Amino acid sequence: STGSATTTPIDSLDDAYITPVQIGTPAQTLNLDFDTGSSDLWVFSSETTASEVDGQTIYTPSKSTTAKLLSGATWSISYGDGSSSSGDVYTDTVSVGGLTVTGQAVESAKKVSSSFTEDSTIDGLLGLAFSTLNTVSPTQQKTFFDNAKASLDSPVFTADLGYHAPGTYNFGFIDTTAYTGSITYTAVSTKQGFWEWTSTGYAVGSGTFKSTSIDGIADTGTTLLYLPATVVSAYWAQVSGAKSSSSVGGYVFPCSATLPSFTFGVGSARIVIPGDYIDFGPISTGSSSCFGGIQSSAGIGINIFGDVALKAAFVVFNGATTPTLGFASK
Question: 5-174, what's its fold?
Answer: Cathepsin D, subunit A; domain 1 (2.40.70)
Strand, helix or coil at 116? Answer: helix
Query: With contact defined as beta carbons under 8 Å apart, do 216 and 303 qualify?
Result: yes
Q: How far is CA 263 from CA 87, 277, 314, in A?
A: 41, 12, 15
Q: How many CA atoms lie within 13 A of 259 on its CB side?
A: 26
Cα 225 from Cα 111, distance rounded (Å): 29
| Of 242, 276, 280, 248, the residue nearest 262 (C-alpha) | 276
Q: Residue 182 burial by CB count (10 A; 0-12/13-18/19+): exposed, middle or buried?
A: exposed
Q: Residue 141 burial by CB count (10 A; 0-12/13-18/19+): exposed, middle or buried?
A: buried
Of 33, 35, 123, 219, catalytic: 35
Q: How many CA atoms lie within 13 A of 31 on its CB side?
A: 15
Query: With contact defined as beta carbons under 8 Å apart, do 242 and 236 qualify?
Result: yes
Active site residue 35: yes
User: Which residue blocks in the chain are alpha helix, DSSP H?
Assistant: 114-117, 144-148, 229-236, 307-310
Cα 311 from Cα 178, distance rounded (Å): 13
Query: With contact defined as beta carbons under 8 Å apart, do 82 and 97 qualify?
Result: no
Q: Which CATH architecture has domain 175-330?
A: Beta Barrel (2.40)
Strand, helix or coil at 115? Answer: helix
Q: Identity (one letter) of the amino acid at 266?
A: V
User: Which residues is the chain interrupted after (C–N above 2.5 Å)?
Assistant: none
Q: How far is CA 187 from CA 36, 206, 215, in A?
A: 16, 27, 11
Name the strand (E) or helix (H) holding 232.
helix 229-236
- DSSP states of 81-97: TS-EEEEEEEEEEEEET
DSSP 265: E
Q: How far is CA 179 from CA 89, 159, 183, 304, 329, in A?
A: 38, 11, 8, 23, 6
Strand, helix or coil at 146? Answer: helix
Would you list the domain boundaries of the chain? Answer: 5-174, 175-330
Query: With contact defined as beta carbons under 8 Å apart, do 325 and 183 qualify?
Result: no
Name the strand (E) or helix (H) holding 258.
none
Name the strand (E) or helix (H) holding 62.
none
Q: How many CA atoms lie within 13 A of 49 on its CB side?
A: 12
Query: With contact defined as beta carbons under 8 Å apart, do 178 and 314 qualify?
Result: yes
Q: Beta partners for 18?
A: 8
Q: Beta partners for 309?
A: none
| Of 188, 180, 190, 189, the residue nearest 271 (C-alpha) | 180
DSSP 183: P
Name the strand (E) or helix (H) holding 42.
strand 41-43
Cα 35 from Cα 15, distance rounded (Å): 13
Query: With contact defined as beta carbons under 8 Å apart, do 84 and 78 qualify?
Result: yes
| Of 322, 287, 315, the residue nearest 36 (C-alpha) | 315
Strand, helix or coil at 149? Answer: helix
Intra-chain end-to-end CA distance of the chain, in Å: 25
Cα 309 from Cα 294, distance rounded (Å): 9
Q: Identity (one letter) of the amino acid at 65?
A: T
Cα 253 from Cα 71, distance rounded (Å): 52
Of 64, 199, 261, 297, catalytic: 199
H helix count then E strand count, the chain: 4, 24
Quick one: resolution in A? 1.3
175-330 and 5-174 share a CATH fold: yes
Cα 51 from Cα 108, distance rounded (Å): 16
| Of 195, 243, 247, 241, the residue nearest 218 (C-alpha) | 195
Cα-Cα-Cα-Cα dihedral sign, residues 78, 82, 11, 309: negative
| 184: number of Cβ within 10 Å | 20
